[PDB]
């Protein structure tokens, strides 16, 4: 209701971290839809690591997203409105594209109202009323592990919060899973 | 009195005067769009079909209202912003909202198809103009696979 | 049984006669259905829905257009599309939507004079209905004012 | 004629001050006694105004020049 794009930059470096979502099977929303058209928090550190793929304030249109795509960029921190340091408003370089105009947002077009209508409109079209079996072939990465190898050689984990990721051949995550307390892993 | 001079006066004043059409469940921001009138023998608004997909408006009896921008700034706001050529991409997503909905895609999916054996199989044609000259002649099939020259 | 009934007539068992355009004069490929459908006219006729208003009567408690057609009244430019005008950058459109064309009696006299002279310009003034609301809240035990 | 206001945005990168520059100019062509600076097609003041924005001979700066310079004509005629 109240929220007018009123400055050009906040001049900060906070933001959130976009990763493509993996519900537990296939990737269901890829990176180049969530990232597409938003201004980076800091530069993209390419996995040629200490290579700077894009700079720290560049709008990521389709070319830059393709260069992110070829070098398999894993997680991208990005300027969001939630962390935008604008006073009484939203700066331009924390919002990005209008999505109806193929460039940065102009100073003023109140994204609060276009936000709320664009959220609430498809609500007329909504509804109202064991183990782990991996799928593809890649490397296994574990997250926050506290484990022990049993008497037979299978691994079991003494921490609930350990997450089972299947990294691909390149280095991004392509599967993610929950491993409970004292679960008999095969690998 | 409805004289035959004032229809010419109205044809003067509605040469470049946009109007703001609205549909009553005005959900998202495409619900009011500007247009230019072209006067119609009849009593119902004729409305461009692509815009129907933006208006969520089939022709089962939907009723749309017209408003008129009076002042000059309002006409410039209509033509600059709310003209229908501007709104081609939704603010929800970068997808086109000018999607060809239902008949036109049937015409295409019937047009760009291919059966294996019909009139004019495998012949050669210098360009698309001989293709349309074949189809309007009724000498070749609409959907039969042909090598042509394209540029 | 419908196929047998068609077999009683001369009309084909497929049911679909080939047809010819009146413009091209040549055959529609893939023959099409014809028949007799029993159809109805409904009483939502257009001349009981088509309606317009330049400037007619104004309502009494609020200097606003009347509602309906039997009273020769305007359309309701409702709330959701005020939000939709907020969604565009259209301000002057809205500012004449709910001040000149709607509420302030002085501003639409000025507007009517300016159109018939050939000027396109608005003089806002103030919505009458907001001033009515001000006298309502003020008509309770509430001091409400405007500053400079 | 008029189909888009694309190139007007291509010379004025705001798409909102397009409306104020255009309203200032076409107001200066309807009320004020000034000719169009472009050949017309018996168009209205609006498409003439945006059409002059298409050729880039008007933006906010030139309008500042004409308000200031015709303003000094209103100073020099005052004596």
């Amino acid at each position: 209701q109240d929220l007018v794009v009123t400055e050009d930059d906040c001049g900060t470096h906070e933001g959130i971290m976009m990763t493509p979502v993996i519900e537990g099977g296939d990737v269901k929303e890829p990176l180049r839809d969530r990232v597409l058209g938003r201004v980076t928090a800091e530069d993209v550190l390419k996995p040629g690591t200490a290579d700077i793929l894009v700079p720290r304030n560049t709008l990521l249109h389709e070319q830059w997203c393709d260069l992110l795509e070829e070098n398999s960029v894993d997680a991208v921190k990005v300027r969001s409105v939630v962390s935008c340091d604008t006073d009484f408003g939203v700066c331009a370089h924390c919002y990005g594209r209008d999505l109806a105009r193929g460039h940065i947002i102009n100073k003023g077009e109140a994204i609060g109202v276009i936000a709320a209508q664009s959220i609430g409109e498809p609500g007329t079209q909504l509804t109202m009323r064991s183990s782990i079996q991996v799928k593809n072939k890649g490397s296994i990465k574990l997250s926050n592990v506290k484990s022990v190898v049993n008497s037979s050689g299978k691994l079991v984990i003494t921490s609930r919060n350990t997450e089972l990721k299947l990294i691909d051949e390149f280095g991004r995550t392509k599967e993610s899973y929950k491993v409970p307390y004292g679960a008999v892993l095969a690998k | 009195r409805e004289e035959a001079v004032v229809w010419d006066i109205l044809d003067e004043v509605i040469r470049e005067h946009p109007v703001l059409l609205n549909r009553a469940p005005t959900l998202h921001r495409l619900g009011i769009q500007a247009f230019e009138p072209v006067l119609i023998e009849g009593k119902a608004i004729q409305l461009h079909p692509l815009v129907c997909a933006a208006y969520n408006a089939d022709f089962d009896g939907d009723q749309m209202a017209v408003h008129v921008p009076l002042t000059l700034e309002a006409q410039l706001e209509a033509r600059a912003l709310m003209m229908s050529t501007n709104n081609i991409l939704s603010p929800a997503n970068g997808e086109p909202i000018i999607v060809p909905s239902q008949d036109v895609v049937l015409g295409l999916y019937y047009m760009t198809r291919d059966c294996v054996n019909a009139k004019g199989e495998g012949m050669v044609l210098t360009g698309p103009k001989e293709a349309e000259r074949l189809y309007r002649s009724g000498l070749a099939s609409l959907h039969a696979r042909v090598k042509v020259r394209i540029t | 049984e419908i196929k047998e009934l068609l077999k009683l007539g001369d009309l084909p068992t497929s049911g679909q006669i080939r047809l010819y355009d009146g413009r091209t004069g040549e055959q529609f490929e893939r023959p099409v259905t014809v028949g007799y459908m029993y159809m109805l006219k409904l009483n939502h006729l257009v001349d009981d829905k088509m309606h317009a208003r330049s400037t007619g009567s104004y309502s009494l408690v609020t200097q606003q257009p009347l509602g309906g057609k039997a009273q020769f009244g305007g359309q309701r430019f409702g709330e959701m599309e005020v939000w939709a005008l907020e969604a565009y950058g259209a301000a002057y459109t809205l500012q004449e939507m709910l001040t000149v064309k709607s509420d302030d009696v002085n501003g639409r006299t000025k507007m009517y004079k300016n159109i018939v002279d050939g000027n396109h310009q608005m003089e806002p003034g103030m919505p009458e209905s907001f001033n009515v609301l001000l006298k309502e809240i003020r008509s309770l035990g509430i001091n409400i004012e405007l500053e400079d | 004629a008029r189909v888009t206001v694309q190139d007007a945005v291509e010379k004025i990168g705001n798409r909102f001050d397009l409306v104020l520059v255009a309203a200032r100019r076409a107001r200066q062509m309807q009320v004020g006694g000034k000719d169009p600076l472009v050949p017309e097609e018996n168009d209205k003041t609006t498409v003439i105004a945006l059409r002059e924005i298409e050729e880039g001979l008007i933006n906010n700066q030139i309008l500042d020049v004409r308000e200031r310079q015709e303003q000094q004509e209103q100073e020099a005629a005052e004596l």
Partner: peptide, 16 residues
């Protein structure tokens, strides 16, 4: 204070 009127409140807030 949204679009064209945001330029207008740039003017009015710029004056006071």
């Amino acid at each position: 204070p949204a679009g064209t009127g945001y330029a207008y409140h740039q003017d009015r807030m710029r004056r006071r």
